[PDB]
Design a protein around this ligand. Sequence first.
Ligand SMILES: Nc1ncnc2c1ncn2[C@@H]1O[C@H](COP(=O)(O)O)[C@@H](OP(=O)(O)O)[C@H]1O
Length: 212
Amino acid sequence: ATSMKIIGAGFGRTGTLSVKAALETLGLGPCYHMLTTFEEPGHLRLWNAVSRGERVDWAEIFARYRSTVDWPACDHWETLAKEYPEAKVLLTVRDSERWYDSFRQTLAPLWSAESADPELAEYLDLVRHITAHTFGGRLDDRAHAIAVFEEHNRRVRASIPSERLLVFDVREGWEPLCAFFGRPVPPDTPFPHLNDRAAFQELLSRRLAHRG
Ligand SMILES: Nc1ncnc2c1ncn2[C@@H]1O[C@H](COP(=O)(O)O)[C@@H](OP(=O)(O)O)[C@H]1O
């Protein structure tokens, strides 16, 4: 069977696309990511149902996945860790000021957009929901967004038994990730460094064009 082994609790802009690539290389995928929501039909509607508080069977989202990182799932780490008690929790972190610059320059413009494109309505509803419930409706307030990031990270660390949680900065490379799961380090392989910008812009254009 396909079993969920890793719940990613880190926010976007903490290297989650790189971690997705790394986990899949280690045989711990398929790994879910924000980008996956655009590749799985029905999944943005499922995530908005989750966001509204509907009863949603998590298997309808994750049955084919062994790991998840990034939004939208990272906001639901607490429920997911109870759903999947044998899964580890992976918290990716980053220094807060640089995290916010990354968030403000890449995600906030997308999340704050108005679009007349019907194909983006489900996505915008979802990231507006995240803006509302995780950020209290404000993305432009630097100190506030940083306070949300730091409290999110702290609440994960306070809530998950220590042996079940890895706190990881992607700048550390393979070694602590591999050691935590007891897997070998891939030889002569740099840790992935995926910017997670242009890939999403391509998925947006594919969705507007109805490609795939
Ligand atoms: N191996 C690595 N070392 C350092 N930063 C990395 C990295 N892999 C990804 N990142 C940074 O993580 C951010 C993307 O994270 P995510 O996939 O969660 O959206 C990007 O930040 P920047 O916007 O500063 O380039 C990317 O540069």
